[PDB]
Symmetry: C3
Subunit: 224 residues, 3 copies
């Protein structure tokens, strides 16, 4: 199309699609029940992202929100993606460490709150209030990060969890910043650059994260 961000949406669609196919093929033949869980979660994540990238590319997942006296292009489909994919990603971490159910519920619920309030902020027509939602969403993210560090095994489990926790902190923490400087927030970075940034983050957080996880012996039960 003639939205300059189309190229990043197209590459995102492609990389999510290819990552989905790769993980699908890779998990073919896996019989270990524990490993199956990780393959399922980890393949579902970019498959969902693929659909939502495509919806943005085709224009379905874009709406105009009036605020600051303009009609502002907001890609709402990102939140529909994140609503499902972010708890899934947290579930991969939580299963790695054999987290308590209470802890999993805390994580999933805080994540739901993070995404839902981010969506509310994204669609809010009173400019100043958009940042209230951003702050609440960010608080939920900080709670999530706190639990990953202070709320929790085989040495390979510890090692893989540590690496993935670090990837998670670094990549996830960038999202509120991009939103804040981008078209959803202060509008200091144009939508095409914002789209590029989220594409790099998303591909790393999904396909990159998944490559790290699915390469590890941590996803298998200890078997002779």
């Amino acid at each position: 199309t003639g939205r300059p961000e189309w190229i990043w949406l197209a590459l995102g669609t492609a990389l999510m699609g290819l990552g989905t196919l790769y993980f699908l093929v890779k998990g073919m033949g896996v019989s270990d029940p524990d490993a199956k869980k990780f393959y399922a979660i980890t393949t579902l994540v970019p498959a969902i992202a693929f659909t939502m990238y495509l919806s943005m590319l085709l224009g379905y997942g874009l709406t105009m929100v009036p605020f600051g006296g303009e009609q502002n292009p907001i890609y709402w489909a990102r939140y529909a993606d994140w609503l499902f994919t972010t708890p899934l990603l947290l579930l991969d971490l939580a299963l790695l460490v054999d987290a308590d159910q209470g802890t999993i519920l805390a994580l999933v619920g805080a994540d739901g709150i993070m995404i839902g309030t981010g969506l509310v902020g994204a669609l809010t027509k009173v400019y100043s209030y958009r940042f209230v939602w951003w702050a609440i969403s960010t608080a939920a993210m900080l709670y999530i990060l706190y639990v990953l560090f202070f709320g929790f095994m085989r040495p390979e489990v510890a090692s893989t969890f540590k690496v993935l926790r670090n990837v998670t902190v670094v990549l996830w923490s960038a999202y509120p910043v991009v939103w804040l400087i981008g078209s959803e927030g202060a509008g200091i970075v144009p939508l095409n650059i914002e789209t590029l940034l989220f594409m790099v983050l998303d591909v790393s957080a999904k396909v990159g994260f998944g490559l790290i996880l699915l390469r590890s012996r941590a996803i298998f039960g200890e078997a002779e």
Copy 2:
């Protein structure tokens, strides 16, 4: 009303309602925990369908989508039904065979993708792109069917699973065809006939499927 498809919506509402009441009464008194799971899942399915049929009958679950240069009546409430009822139905099959959690997640997630992309296709304003969504949704359905045949007990469990798997393949595979030839897709069959077809499919896939399942000794633990 004066929408000619009202009669099929009314009969669908009635048959789902009656099926719900029948399963409710039938599962009264069931104490076996395994059987309770099947009664719960299986009664919930037509209860949800009853609500969404009624919403279509009353006109709430209908919207107009512009495409191909017309205002096209799209019953969106079907997807709200299917979003919940189709994974529930898959859950009945998966519990019958004591499926791995990874496999259940794969099934539920692929199903979510099937329904969500079908909804996107149903609401998409660019005619040609509607069929892209249809294709992606169909791929998700084919993945689901593949898992039911290649991804998986007491002989009565095997026997009941086999029958229900066959019912599932035959009925579910008809949905993409009806959508394709109907008002959502190529518009070769009118909405009133499309509605009739989905009504027959839905009642069979829910109340018919449920009668088969709930009549079986497979839903009970092996007890003396």
Copy 3:
């Protein structure tokens, strides 16, 4: 704002926010896995309510629905809250009594139906039909109440469950009445009083319920 109900929305936001913070601090340090489940569920409930109260206060969670020949202010965000918080509350009760999974699914599903049909009724443009949805929603509520009394331990578990079941029946049963007499239904009580009533009910059903639950020894495994 100049909506007279703003004061009740503001106090609701505050009390849910404070209740969230209190439960969060209170559950700090809890290591018992069973207790963690209850703290997680019970803190998530007012955290979600806090977000949805704030959304109503800020005006995001309000829409106008034409019916009875007027444009009627309907707070839809209540349903988005209840959709998540009501099954969570039922989950607290069900975990207390170690409910069968079938029973939990029945409860959660009936609750989903209660809330979804209440939302449909709230948004329905044909006045008389709003009450059809109300009736169906009420039937789902009555099913839920029936299960809590007829569908189900350590003496402290029994004692706490009994108290919380009674609180639940009394408070939950008031909701259909308020809706019926309020702006969503017959319009005999003005929106500002309706808002006050739901605020008192919600705070009691969430923060009050939670204080009772989290003060009990019932939420802990039996340990030496």
